[PDB]
Amino acid sequence: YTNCKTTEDGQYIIPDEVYTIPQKESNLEMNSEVLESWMNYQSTTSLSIN
Amino acid sequence: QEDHVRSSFLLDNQNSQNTVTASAGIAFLNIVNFKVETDYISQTSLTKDY
Numbered sequence: 439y440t441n442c443k444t445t446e447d448g449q450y451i452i453p454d455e456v457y458t459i460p461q462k463e464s465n466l467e468m469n470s471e472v473l474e475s476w477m478n479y480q481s482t483t484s485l486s487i488n
Numbered sequence: 489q490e491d492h493v494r495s496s497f498l499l500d501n502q503n504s505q506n507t508v509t510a511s512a513g514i515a516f517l518n519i520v521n522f523k524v525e526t527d528y529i530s531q532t533s534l535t536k537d538y
Contacts, residue, residue, distance in 0.1 A: 477535070477537070478535040478536075479535075480534070484527070484531075486525075487525075487526045
């Protein structure tokens with residue numbers, strides 16, 4: 439670190455023997471999946487004998 | 489940025505209602521009186537969602 443070399447954006451100090459290509463890339467992927475099932479069964483039998 | 493939203497909703501519903509009433513009466517002249525009535529109710533409901 440003799441030369442106190444810095445990345446051009448001024449963010450980080452780097453050793454004299456390396457160089458940085460700035461590729462400031464971000465990837466986002468959000469996947470949401472909702473499954474809802476509802477089954478309602480209702481029965482009613484009624485028998486009357488007189 | 490890309491954004492996809494797919495929303496599918498399915499609803500199903502069935503109601504079935506049967507009713508039966510069977511009556512029968514033999515009415516003589518104050519000697520024999522025989523009266524019979526039967527009843528039968530069948531009510532069902534079935535709802536499904538998705």
